[PDB]
Each structure stands twice: as structure tokens, then as C-alpha cells.
Amino acid sequence: ASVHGTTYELLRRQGIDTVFGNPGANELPFLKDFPEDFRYILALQEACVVGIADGYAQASRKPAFINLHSAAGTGNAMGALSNAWNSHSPLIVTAGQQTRAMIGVEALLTNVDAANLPRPLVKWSYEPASAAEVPHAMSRAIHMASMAPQGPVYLSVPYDDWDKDADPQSHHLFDRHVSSSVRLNDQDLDILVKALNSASNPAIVLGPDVDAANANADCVMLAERLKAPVWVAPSAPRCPFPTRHPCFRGLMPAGIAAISQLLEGHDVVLVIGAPVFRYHQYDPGQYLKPGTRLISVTCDPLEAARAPMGDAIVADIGAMASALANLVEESSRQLPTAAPEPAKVDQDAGRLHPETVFDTLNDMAPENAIYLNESTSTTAQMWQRLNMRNPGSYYFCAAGGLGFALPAAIGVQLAEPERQVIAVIGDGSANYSISALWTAAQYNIPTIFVIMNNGTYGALRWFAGVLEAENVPGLDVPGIDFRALAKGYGVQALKADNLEQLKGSLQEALSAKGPVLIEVSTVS
Amino acid sequence: ASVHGTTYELLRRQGIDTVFGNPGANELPFLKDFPEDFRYILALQEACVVGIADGYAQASRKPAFINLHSAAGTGNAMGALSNAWNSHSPLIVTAGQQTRAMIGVEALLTNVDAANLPRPLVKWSYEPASAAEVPHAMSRAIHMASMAPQGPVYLSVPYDDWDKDADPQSHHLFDRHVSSSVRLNDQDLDILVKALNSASNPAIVLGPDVDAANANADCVMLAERLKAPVWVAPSAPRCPFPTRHPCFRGLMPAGIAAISQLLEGHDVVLVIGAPVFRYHQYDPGQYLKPGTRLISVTCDPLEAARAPMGDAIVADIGAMASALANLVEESSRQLPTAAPEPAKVDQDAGRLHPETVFDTLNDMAPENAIYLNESTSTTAQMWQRLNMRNPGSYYFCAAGGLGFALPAAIGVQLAEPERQVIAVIGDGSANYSISALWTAAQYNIPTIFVIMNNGTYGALRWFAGVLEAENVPGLDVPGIDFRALAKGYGVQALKADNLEQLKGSLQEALSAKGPVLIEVSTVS
Amino acid sequence: ASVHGTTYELLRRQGIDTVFGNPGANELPFLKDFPEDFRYILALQEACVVGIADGYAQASRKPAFINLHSAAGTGNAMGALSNAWNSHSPLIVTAGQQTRAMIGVEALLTNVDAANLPRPLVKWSYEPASAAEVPHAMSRAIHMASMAPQGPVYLSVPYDDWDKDADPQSHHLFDRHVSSSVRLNDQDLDILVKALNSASNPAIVLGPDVDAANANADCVMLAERLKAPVWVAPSAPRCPFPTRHPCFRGLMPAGIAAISQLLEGHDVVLVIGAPVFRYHQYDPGQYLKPGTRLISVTCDPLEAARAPMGDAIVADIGAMASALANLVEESSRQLPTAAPEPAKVDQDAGRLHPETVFDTLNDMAPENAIYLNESTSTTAQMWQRLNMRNPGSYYFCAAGGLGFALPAAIGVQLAEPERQVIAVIGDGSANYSISALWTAAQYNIPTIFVIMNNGTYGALRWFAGVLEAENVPGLDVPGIDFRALAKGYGVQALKADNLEQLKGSLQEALSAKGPVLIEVSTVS
Ligand SMILES: Cc1ncc(Cn2c(C)c(CCOP(=O)(O)OP(=O)(O)O)sc2=O)c(N)n1
Ligand SMILES: Cc1ncc(Cn2c(C)c(CCOP(=O)(O)OP(=O)(O)O)sc2=O)c(N)n1
Ligand SMILES: Cc1ncc(Cn2c(C)c(CCOP(=O)(O)OP(=O)(O)O)sc2=O)c(N)n1
Ligand SMILES: [Ca+2]
Ligand SMILES: [Ca+2]
Ligand SMILES: [Ca+2]
Ligand SMILES: [Ca+2]
Ligand SMILES: [Ca+2]
Ligand SMILES: [Ca+2]
Ligand SMILES: [Ca+2]
Ligand SMILES: [Ca+2]
Ligand SMILES: [Ca+2]
Ligand SMILES: [Mg+2]
């Protein structure tokens, strides 16, 4: 067998059947003779390739496979890898290298010092020393991406390797099963359970690795047993809990002092599947108030090490959540009462308040919709206004890197064809990965894109005001016609200048057979 | 003085007056109080920011200053940095970092291990250890980008540094002059000149660093004195010689055997300002035929080290070209005779042959036009069909990384407001950095964009045929309306479906007061 | 031809005839069939291997070739590479890698991520992608080490590569000549010369790259023409000027304020072949006083970039020194007058003052002796008390890293068999690379080692007093018998407890046919 044939066999035996890519000359020897059981998903720029694969992996809860061109293609994707690192996304990033005979002279298309290029945004990065090593290196990539804490990996392959003879002993790679589905030993788990059972006023904080593990329902059981309020950790990349469950208390503010004040009075705070904590604004103060003890369960040693307070347990979130849910006592405390709905913002017959948009989406969208957020100034309101009952219902750029949601929404929709995806994207954010629209059109992936057009980088204007920073350039983005951009890439386009038009456009979009973009005129 | 005030003073004293950027929260404390003598050029995605700055630096022959957001913004620009490295572009890339008090906890927006992120695509990469070090680090960045061999550099700055007190002794940085304008010592230069004077059949090969140095006219003098044919080194990022001068022989093919056959019979081959050589295709054979000696003059130790043959001299290309032009004897050989014009391809009243497009551009464009090429399957024909008399007339992605020419053409046009820029971009290539169009519209930078629309990644279809590679996915890009994309970003748009319409559209474009995009229907 | 045969041919054609090494299993396929025209110099630990090669390269003014074992052997040498980086030493460091078939499984002896291991202490670091690339990679290593600014490089080679067939076209590598012997263009050089001719009170500061270039005599001519005092830049790794010439003013103190005060009143300060400046102690103040302009000539862009003041020229030091010496006017100012000899320290019949030791060495040693210094508390006195008329007469660990002088003195003595080498090494410093003594014994390299035994890390006790730092552990090193260590490794040993015994021991050492160690009891 050839390295080509052996590698595709390994991929299929390890559950991979889709290549997300943008091709180049070093990749043609890999992509030739493309197997009939595989699917290739083309995107027009590599940030879009990786974003689509990322959404697909996160929603599918399985690795996604990517093929990019050399250095320049890898480089175009490195902002997308920044988000993927922070979301623990299991991405297998391959890139083609020049033929081995031409690497030394640094022919055009040579990826110089290739394994260093994507660092520090990958768990493992490698170029094999020979063609017959390629299947083994691919095996390592698969497993490294997939083991807890999951994350992106990088493999560079000289193009001449594919046609070489493989080692027959590479067959031992095909069916390897590698597990990291581990939890705290019984004796120490019993100590933890006792501490939770003994707490007088526990709180729970959940992060994105809960949703990644599909631990949501176990966390519901845990919270009901402990009679405990539940917060989502700050800067949330995913939604780990039903947002209208009685215990839910919403998104934590991303500041040190704000979080310790919120937790004040809670004697035990159990954090599951989050960093401690993904703060954002500078908000100095106490990490915890006196009287509060924190215990973190994380899948990531790096998280456990850097937490400034609390104890930690490094384990698989699914296995831990299930064990805790099933082991804790049912408390005799009263169950928390559900938060009331938020205020209805007054809305005239002109430009839309973002709150109106979210309320209307929540009114009209199916109960199993999936939302993506890249409307950076409206996140707090979005989190209050969408009833998200089910797992896998929310994604937000995990490193704060714009250009995620537009492509990722396409990947999520591909992963979840029965669940309507609605991406809510600011007019600024929409440009970073605009060409991803084409993939939705060409593959008929029926994502709905809601562009919140206020003409400005609103979240930056807000931060500049918090800074009392004057005379800042570059904050306005006038003069973009998003209906014309959608037309450019083959996507049906609608405009909503007022609430009547928003409702009409959403009605049309929700019944369409293909992707749809709605440009919404929002308040400045 | 503050670090902010001291840093902007250093920048202005070192000739910097423009910031190419896409802002974020870590950069607002740098960008606030933006000096009135500086200009900010916004682009909507970081590949576009860096591409525009790159074109501006290359055309202006001076450093360009960039400000990007953290890790994600830097990451989005790394494909653009791949080209910048290969073109020796003097780019000062700054990125904002989290406040020092929040770096340890890895708050959102922290650039982890920041100095490693852009490697290996930068000459120098650094994060200062204190706020008062920032002006000095900026000084180092300026000089490192600007010294031969020029190239990109990276500086990460925690956002709290700007408001701190500067060291008063940073004033010594302001007026530092750093020169690398050096040439071979007289004794060894005399040996070289003797070897050139003694050659019976010399040839000259020129690369991009000639055009960067504005050494073109000295190279003309050299070639006329030596009575020598002149080739442009393969994979050419720039044009180093007048393309209708009698000595000009065109673009070398990017293959080992092809180049040694071309040089056969030339006893001395002098290469100036090029790698030896930027081969592309696999074309094995002899590096040089018996009888040919090669001498390379390069500004880059890395080039000199990796050449597989010949002697080398590492020196400034401007200083060396001038010294050689003025020192060599006038040979009594006959001057080379000019190449004839190429064939006129037969053209019906339907879709355009690329050759027709280039001939028409050459007919209609001003004699001081500047061309950019990202029409990857048509490069050889472009090189034969454009009469480029002047320096600075051609740019092509120096690493082969698509997404360069569209933004770079905007930067070149900003650098050279009297010279009409015409970017010839394939329909595939146009998507990588499509949002750069907006910057042309907003700043009214009157670049002309000629989109060669054949519906496919034509250069990849060609390579796949050379490979006899069948069943390759991802090679077709149907269904893009480039007039609608131009409308989306505010650029006047025209379509040319035949030669009559091409001429009419070019006539309109050449007289327009703003940027114009022409979508040309080219043969498949 | 094999890769083995081709590589040794390249080495010999490029002037390499000696391998400094400590062997291991991955290196046996390189070292087998060792050519009869090569010499292997074994040392017992890799810090010693590299130190010996470093001294040999620095004294010989040519590259030295090293072969180490994998990761562990490379790792043992990284402190030695720290010094080599700072001294611009042209060292070609090769290390053997596992066979390509075993690298993926990470068999014992695999050097993981090999090219990253010696960073940031090398100019270039690489592992070839195929066996036939090895000769080319070796070529690149040779040239990268040898081009200005010279420095160490690293090449990792899988052991199975050596027996493979080489590319016949590797013959083009054998006789490549690569020059970086460049100087400032005539127009700008004339500006510099005018500035020097016009100065009313010039000063010259010289660094180690002067001695490396053997530019010493040109600098003497320059100083005599300009009638200028001459200082050696701080933290001096080499001696660039005759220490009893009338212009010599000694070693500059390694502090910011101290140097600006020293230069006060000098209108133009010309620095040649030094960083600006290798300060050590914290001594805050002005970089330069008003009225002083600084101009630096450096072979290293990194030096030029980081200088906090002055103009800079990046060029070869030999070519620049010769051009300046020959171009400047003879000033009518009076020549500086020579410094008087230093004080004679009062010396009783007991333990030796270091000053006594240096005076006695200067009395007894040949005029062409070469000194190495690793007696860290006595450097200022050493610099005042040794008359060093000739180039190549002094070496000191250029990064301050102990373990250099003992092995380097062996390499220097091998490089300069007619010049008696005398290494003056503290009792603390002697231990770092003690096993290097064996190489002197086995090869009969007649270095004299003078161990200054005061029982303590004296320079650290001094710094702790400057800090008023009390209760510092680890500063005393009692209980070392250096005569017994010398016996252990086969070196003749003598003890000097007083001046009479010092003179007797030096008389014996200077007439010995082999290496000799003298343990001197020095004052505490
Ligand atoms: C790749 C990248 N570049 C720049 C930014 C900076 N950025 C920018 C540019 C923001 C404004 C986004 O504007 P929008 O129109 O999408 O939404 P709002 O108007 O609601 O803020 S929010 C912020 O973090 C970023 N995070 N990521
Ligand atoms: C960033 C990046 N991604 C992918 C490629 C691969 N690439 C691609 C995708 C080519 C086709 C470009 O198509 P085009 O329409 O712009 O021009 P032609 O049809 O004339 O080839 S040429 C080639 O090198 C690349 N070089 N750079
Ligand atoms: C490899 C290494 N380790 C530790 C040190 C620290 N070091 C030490 C340990 C010094 C004392 C050397 O003692 P000595 O006996 O050689 O000489 P003095 O007593 O004259 O200081 S000087 C100083 O920089 C160093 N520079 N290099
Ligand atoms: Ca409602
Ligand atoms: Ca699915
Ligand atoms: Ca907005
Ligand atoms: Ca014509
Ligand atoms: Ca200009
Ligand atoms: Ca095309
Ligand atoms: Ca004396
Ligand atoms: Ca010698
Ligand atoms: Ca001592
Ligand atoms: Mg990197």
C-alpha cells in the first residue's frame, strides 16, 4: 500500500470522513484519487476553512480534519487557531510541504521551520522525517487532538511522501482506541462529595467544556440535588445549561471584583469545565471574599495551574459531572426560583434596538435553534433574551477573535442539519471572514446570518469611553452593503430597517430552502 | 513625558507618519490622543492591513508601521507575513497585549507566549519587560526592520505601558542613524570587476532586491557595459529591469534543469539581488552546466548560505550595483538585440484570452502604470506583454501566498499617487483579501482592480495535469458576482464579457476619480 | 559517492580538518572510516568539547567543527554555547539523531524537536528532510557560522543518512566562496572620515570583534593618526589593543553612569567591534553627557539595533578598520602619553595577593604569551598588570558563563603552539569544566593552568556586599585539592603557598614539556 492509501484508511478507521480545505500545489498529491467515501468542503480563504471545521467539530463533539496550503495558508488560519485553542477544539490541521528534494534550497512554497509556524496555538506540531512515518504521525495527530484537554494539532507533509510505499506494520494504527475518560479516585471523590453535601449555600459555575462533553443534563441534576444557583463562567464560548431552568443565573461579569462580590456568601463554589476565570476588563479587588472556598474541575492542567485561588481536580468533564450528579445527596433546601424575563425595551418604528432583535429571534426561532454570537457590544443582552433549552445552542469566539461566527455557523449547520442555526454578527465582525458565505451557498447549508448594522465598532467605542480615551481613530465602518456582499457570494439577502420588516424577513428566512442573510439596521 | 508621547516622538523622528491598523481593546491606549501629524489607515481584516502596509513599504522603499489586535489579529495576518518575509519588506508589526496585571491569569485577549507567535516569519520578535523599555524596544524594531536584509519585525506591548512615565534618556533614541549601505572591499571588488571584464559571454540575473534598492538604472548601465543579456530570477516578486530594453530576456523558468540549460554557454553568470534560485516545479538536473561559473550578490546571509552553487558576496544591493556599474569596462562585443513582441492570440467576439487582456492593458495604460499580479495561471504571458520602463512597476506575492495583490495594490497606490495602479487578480485569488476594497473606497485610493474570471483555480488544474493527478476536489469556484462584491464595499464596478466591453470599461476606469473594479470573463 | 564521503570532502574543501567531539551511538556512522587527513580531539564532557573548539576557533580566526551526541550531549554544551554566541565564535555544532525509522516512536536517543534545542544560542539550527540533503545542509552550516556576524550553528543528522547515496550535484558545494568582507560606501565613508578629522577631542572604544578580525594594528594606526585615547569596551571577551601603547587607557567600567562620565568632554566617540555597551552592574544615569556624539561600527545588526544611543554602521570590522586607518588625517594634536604602571601591592611571606600573581606572570611569561581569565574577582587588576603587545593575547567568557577558560585554554594552545598559554582560573571556576584537563594530558597540549585558590566565590561575596545582602548561602567552596584533581587527569601539578614557591613553580611550568597546573594560595 502507498502512504496515501494507508493514511486515508487510518482516517476512515478513526471516524474521519470530511476534509475542510483550501487546496494548493503541495496538497494535490494528497487530494488526488480522493476517496469516494470522503467529502471535501471548500472554503475560499483559510480563516474560513478553519472556522467552518471548528464549528463542525464543536457541534459534532468529534475531531475535524483540515488541509491547508503550506506556510501562507497555515498563516491565513492562525487567528482561527487562536479561537480553537481557547475552545479546546479537536482540529487536525494538515499542510502540504515542498518535495523533500527542494526543501533545502527553499524553493517557492517551502514551509520553513514548519513545525514552529502555528506555535503557541497547537498542542502538538510536527513534520515527519520520512514518508513511511507519515501514517504514524497522522495517528499521533488524531490522538493528540482528541485526548483531554482537546485542541488543535499541526502536521506538515512533503508532497512526495504520498506516493511512497507505506510500512505494512502501519496497520496496527488503524483501530487504536485511546481514552482519557477519567475521574477522581473514589476516596478523594468521596471527600469532594462530602464537602458539597455539607455546604450551607453552594453555588455552581459552568464553562464551555461542560457543553463540549454534553455534561449539561448531569449538571442540571447536580444543581437540582444541591439546590444551587448556576452561573456561566465569563467570556463564555458555549452555553452549558438551560437558560430558563430555575437555578440559572446567567453570564458572570468578566471582572475580578465583580465575581468575588457575586460569590459573596456562598461557602462552596464548584466550578466545572471553565478556566478560573476568563476575566476581561480590569476590575481589581479580591479573587474571593472571606468565607468562600472554590473547587475547580477542569480537563486542562494549564487551567488548573494558573487559577489564582481554589483547589482543582484535573479530569474528564463528562465522567466527573456524571459521577457527582449521581453521588451527591438531595438537599432539603428550597430549589432556587427562576429569574424573571428581562425588560422589553421601548421600540419605535425606526432602527432596531438589539434587545428587540433578540426578543424577536426568541419569539420566532424553533426551540432547538442554535445561535452564534459575534455582535460584540450586545452579548449581555443576548444572554438574557434567548431561551436555550438544549445543549449545543450557543457559540462565541473563545479567544475573542473576530471572524469565527460566520464560518463556524456554517460548520455547526452542517453538523446539525435538523437544528436551525442563526448567527448574529455585527457589521464590523462580518467582514473578517465574509467569503465563508460562498461555502454556504455552494453546499446549500441553510444557515441564517443576521447582520447587526450600526455602522461602528460599538464595543470599542464603549471601551474607549470606559478609558475616557479620546481621539481614537478607526472606530467607524460606514458604507458596507451587506445585501450586495451576500449577492456576491450567492446567498439570498433581505433587509430589515424596522420591526415590521424584521419580522417579515425572519419569516421568509425561516422558511427558505437555502442560506439567508438579513441586514438589520440597528441603533447607533 | 509618557511612554505614549515618547514613542510617537521616536516614530516621527524616524520618518514614520502612518499607522496601518485594525483596532482592538489592547490597542486603544496606544491609539488614543492620536497625533494630528499621523494618519491612520483602517482595513477590515488583518491580512488586508498587512498587505496594504506591505505594498506601501515596498513602493515607498521605507518602513511601514502596523498595529494589530493581540494574538487573533496577529494570527489573521500571518499569511501576509509569509509574503513579507520573502520580499524583504520592512514592516514594523505591533500588537497590543493585556494589562500586565492580567497576563498571568490569561484573561481574555492575552497573547500567550507572544514573541513566539509570528515566528519564523519575522527577523526579530519581542515583548518588553517593563513600560519604560517600550521606546527602546520600538527603536530596536525600527532598525531591525530597516537594516539589510530588510524584513518584518514584531513587538507586543501591554496596554498599561503607554500611560507610564518614560525614561528621559530615551531621547537618545530619536535621531539614531543606522547604516547597512556597504559594499565589498576594494581589493576583492577589483578581483570581481576583473572577472566580469574577462568574461567572454557574461549573463546577468536580477532579483527583487534590485528594484527595492532602486538599483535598476545602475543595472541597465552594467548590462550595457558588459553587453550582457539580462534575465529576471524565477518566481519574481518585483521587476528589476526595463522590459523592452535590448538586453532584457524575460522571466526565468523556475526549474533546476531549465535554468542550467538557459545559462549554458555563459561563462560567468552574475546574479544580483535574488536567491539562487527560487525554483518552484520539480525539474531535476544540473544546477549549472560545465563551463558556467556563478557569482551572487545578495543582501541576505540566508540566501548566500543556501545557494547550491557559485560564489557569493553579502552586501547592500544599491551600493554594489552602483560600484559595479561604474567600475566595469565597456566591452567591444555587440549589444544584445531586443526581443520581438510576442504573438497576438486569435480573439473572437466572446470570452477574453488572458493574452488579449494584457495586450489591451499595455495599449491603454499610462507608461508609468504599476501592475500587480495575482492571476496565477497567466504570469508568463503577463511578463511578455507589459512594457514596464520604470522601477517599481510590478509586484507579485513573494511567497506565492494569495491575498497579497488586492490589498497591496491599495498600498502601492497610496505610495505612488501619480502612477496608476492596475491589479490583475484571478477570481480565486480575489476572495482571500476581498474586504480590502473597502479601504480603497473609504480613503478614495484610485486603484483599478481587473478580475480575471474563469471560474476555476486554473494554476492548480494545470499542476494537476502535470501530475496526471485525477479526481482532485476543490478546484472550481463558480458563482461569484464580483460586481456585487465591489458594490458591497463601495467600489465602482464594471463588467467586460468581450473585447469591446473590455476597452470601454478600461476607458471608463482610467478616467474615474475613485477605485474601479472590472470583472473580465476570461476563457476557461 | 555516499553522504559520508561527500560530507568529509566538503569539510576538507572548506578548510576543516579537526573534529572536536564526545562520541555516542548516533554519531558512530559519521565517525566510522574517519579520514586519515582529519584529527579527532576527544574531551570527556560536552561543555569541555565546545570550550576547546571555541578557543581553537577564536585563536585561529576560522570555523571549528564539533560532533556531539543527540539531545543530552547538545544539552551538556549549552552553557558553552551561551559564551560562543556572545563572542561571535564560528562553531559548527553537529549532533547525531536516531535512525529515521525510529524517530516517530521516540526511541531512546531521539533528539525530539531537535532544531529547537539550542535556540536562542545559535544563528541557524536545522535537521535535513532527507539523507541526500545532508551535504547541502552542512554547506549552509559552514557558511552561516562564518559570515559576519560570526556565531554558532547547529545541524542534527539521522544516523542512517551517512551511508546513503549522495546527489552528484553536491560537488558544486565544495569550492563555494562566500564573502561578507564589506565596508561603508565611499560617499558615506567620506562623511565619517570628515567627522573624525574635525573632532576636537576624539576617543576610541574597541571591542572583541577587532581582535577577531586581527584589526588591532589598523586600530593602532587609527589611534595614532587621530591622537586619540583608546579604551576597551566593558566586559571584554578579548584584547583589541597593545596594553602599553601610549594611547591605551584600559578596560571601561561596566556601568551606564561610569561610562558617560569617562567619555565626558570627548566630542566624538568612535566605537569599533563592540556592543554599545555590555554593561553589568546597575549604575543608572546618562548614556552620554551633553556634548558627546557616539558612532559605532559593528559587524552585528543586533548590536546596532539595541544600542541606546549613537549612530551605527553595520560592516566587517577588518575592512572598516583598514579603510579608516588609511583615510583619516594625521592630527597636529599631541599624542596621548602612556599610563604609568600600577602600584606594587605590599606582599608578606604568606598567601598571595592576586596583584602579586599578575605582576609575577608579567615578569616571567614570554612576550607572546596568551592569557585566559576566569578569576572573576580580579579582572580589573589583571587588565592593569599584563603587558599584552600582540593580538590574540586575552580571552574571557563572553557571556560571563563559567567553565570556558579551562577548556578554551587548551583549544587556544592547540591553535597557537608557539605561544605559551597561561589560564588564570579561580578555584570556583575551575570545577565547571575540570575534566578538560584530560584532553591537555592526552594530546600533550602544554597549557599552564594557574588556579587562584581563595576558598570562596569571591566576586559573589563582593556583589552581595554591594547589595548589603546578608545571609546568602552557597558562597564558599572549601576543601578542593587541585593538585589531586590534576593528578586524576594526568597533568603535572605544583603548589604555591607564597611568592618564593610561586616563582619556583612558574619557572618549572614554563620549562615543562607538557601541561602544568599550579595551585596558588591567594588571600581571602
Ligand atoms: C481579529 C480581531 N480583530 C480585531 C478585534 C477587535 N474588536 C473589534 C474590532 C470589535 C468591534 C466589532 O464590531 P461589530 O460591528 O461586529 O459589533 P459591535 O458594534 O456590537 O461592537 S470588538 C473587538 O474585540 C478582535 N477582537 N479580533
Ligand atoms: C493562501 C493561499 N492558499 C492557497 C494557495 C494555492 N493556490 C491557488 C488556490 C491557486 C489558484 C488561484 O486561482 P485564480 O483564479 O486566482 O487564478 P488562475 O485561475 O489564473 O490560477 S494558485 C495556488 O498557489 C496559495 N498559493 N495561497
Ligand atoms: C555557569 C555559571 N554559574 C554560575 C555563575 C556565577 N558566578 C560565580 C559562581 C562566580 C564566582 C567564581 O569564583 P572563582 O573562585 O572562580 O573566582 P573569584 O573568587 O575571583 O570570584 S562569578 C559569577 O558570575 C556563572 N557566572 N556561570
Ligand atoms: Ca417574547
Ligand atoms: Ca451530525
Ligand atoms: Ca457594529
Ligand atoms: Ca500593442
Ligand atoms: Ca509617496
Ligand atoms: Ca481563475
Ligand atoms: Ca614588573
Ligand atoms: Ca595554528
Ligand atoms: Ca575563589
Ligand atoms: Mg509561531
Swiss-Prot record, chains A, B, C:
Belongs to the TPP enzyme family. Mg(2+) binds at N116, L117, R119. This is Benzoylformate decarboxylase. Pfam families: TPP_enzyme_C (PF02775), TPP_enzyme_M (PF00205), TPP_enzyme_N (PF02776). GO terms for molecular function: acetolactate synthase activity; benzoylformate decarboxylase activity; flavin adenine dinucleotide binding; magnesium ion binding; thiamine pyrophosphate binding. It comes from Pseudomonas putida (Arthrobacter siderocapsulatus). It catalyses: phenylglyoxylate + H(+) = benzaldehyde + CO2. Pathway: Aromatic compound metabolism; (R)-mandelate degradation; benzoate from (R)-mandelate: step 3/4. Homotetramer. PROSITE patterns: TPP_ENZYMES. It is an enzyme of class 4 (lyase). Residues 376-459 are annotated as: Thiamine pyrophosphate binding. One of its GO terms (biological process) is mandelate catabolic process. Binds 1 Ca(2+) ion per subunit. Keywords: Aromatic hydrocarbons catabolism, Calcium, Decarboxylase, Lyase, Magnesium, Mandelate pathway, Metal-binding, Thiamine pyrophosphate. Its EC number is 4.1.1.7. Its cofactor is Ca(2+); thiamine diphosphate; Mg(2+). Ca(2+) binds at D427, N454, T456. SUPFAM superfamilies: DHS-like NAD/FAD-binding domain, Thiamin diphosphate-binding fold (THDP-binding). It comes from the Bacteria.
